[PDB]
Amino acid sequence: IFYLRNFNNWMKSVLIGEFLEKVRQKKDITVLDLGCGKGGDLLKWKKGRINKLVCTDIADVSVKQCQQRYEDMKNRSEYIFSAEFITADSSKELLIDKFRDPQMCFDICSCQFVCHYSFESYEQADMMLRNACERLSPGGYFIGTTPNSFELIRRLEASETESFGNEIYTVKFQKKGDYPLFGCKYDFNDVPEFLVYFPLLNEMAKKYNMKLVYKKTFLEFYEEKIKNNENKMLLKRMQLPLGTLSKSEWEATSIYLVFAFEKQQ
Ligand SMILES: Nc1ncnc2c1ncn2[C@@H]1O[C@H](C[C@H](N)CC[C@H](N)C(=O)O)[C@@H](O)[C@H]1O
Numbered sequence: 001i002f003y004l005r006n007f008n009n010w011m012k013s014v015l016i017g018e019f020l021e022k023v024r025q026k027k028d029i030t031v032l033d034l035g036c037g038k039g040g041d042l043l044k045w046k047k048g049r050i051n052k053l054v055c056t057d058i059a060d061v062s063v064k065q066c067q068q069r070y071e072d073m074k075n076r077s078e079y080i081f082s083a084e085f086i087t088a089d090s091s092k093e094l095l096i097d098k099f100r101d102p103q104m105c106f107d108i109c110s111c112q113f114v115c116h117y118s119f120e121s122y123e124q125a126d127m128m129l130r131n132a133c134e135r136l137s138p139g140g141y142f143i144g145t146t147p148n149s150f151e152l153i154r155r156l157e158a159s160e161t162e163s164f165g166n167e168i169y170t171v172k173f174q175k176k177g178d179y180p181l182f183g184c185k186y187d188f189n190d191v192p193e194f195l196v197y198f199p200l201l202n203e204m205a206k207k208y209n210m211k212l213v214y215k216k217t218f219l220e221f222y223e224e225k226i227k228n229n230e231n232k233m234l235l236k237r238m239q240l241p242l243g244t245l246s247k248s249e250w251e252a253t254s255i256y257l258v259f260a261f262e263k264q265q
Pocket residue numbers: 034035036037038040041056057058059062088089090091092111112113114117118
């Protein structure tokens with residue numbers, strides 16, 4: 001369990017940091033962490049020296065864990081951002097209606113391992129994308145990590161059943177051979193997720209004046225980003241390709257992709 005979560009932390013680290021550098025090339029960094037969980041990315045924002053962060057999640061128990069983690073860091077002379085915490089279903093509720101400041105603006109929306117939950121339906125996928133995008137400033141960024149639908153199906157079609165995996169993970173599709181845009185249900189060991197067809201996410205984000213910066217598979221992102229010595233030293237410290245992970249860990253990790261979109265002027 002540890003090694004993978006750690007590789008995923010490194011992934012989000014390198015992803016978050018590139019877009020904070022990109023952000024800062026244009027003269028008070030305000031960030032929306034959408035589906036923030038227990039606050040696994042609070043330190044990344046702290047290290048990035050953002051000034052404001054809104055943390056929101058469907059699970060109140062996790063948001064309260066996020067809030068306590070934050071109070072702990074704050075309680076323990078060094079700079080920390082101010083933070084707003086909201087328990088909401090971002091696929092059914094409108095965050096503009098929840099913020100203290102409805103007309104608040106964000107420089108980044110980070111959406112890490114969350115989007116696949118909103119694709120239960122069109123209304124939900126579109127709502128979570130509005131929430132992510134409508135308040136980004138011109139030039140601001142929508143960044144995330146979600147399973148690559150191409151790799152799920154590849155592995156589905158190779159399989160003798162509706163299931164596949166190794167000792168680390170299991171995928172179990174509800175149905176096989178049928179891939180609707182919305183509602184394409186699978187299990188991933190433990191909640192139900194829904195297939196995210198990336199061409200459809202890309203297209204759908206044009207409604208909120210967003211152009212794709214890049215989509216990379218995890219393996220592609222890994223091998224490009226290891227070439228930066230600073231990203232590589234970070235991996236060194238925090239810890240198919242040969243080393244860094246096992247065969248089985250690359251197998252689990254290689255399911256995912258990384259994306260970045262930009263609000264246009
Ligand atoms: N409709 C929704 N709105 C907001 N959060 C959701 C929704 N559906 C699932 N989630 C949350 O999204 C998160 C899924 C992620 N696996 C947690 C990842 C967390 N951002 C991290 O990178 O550590 C969980 O916290 C779920 O509670």
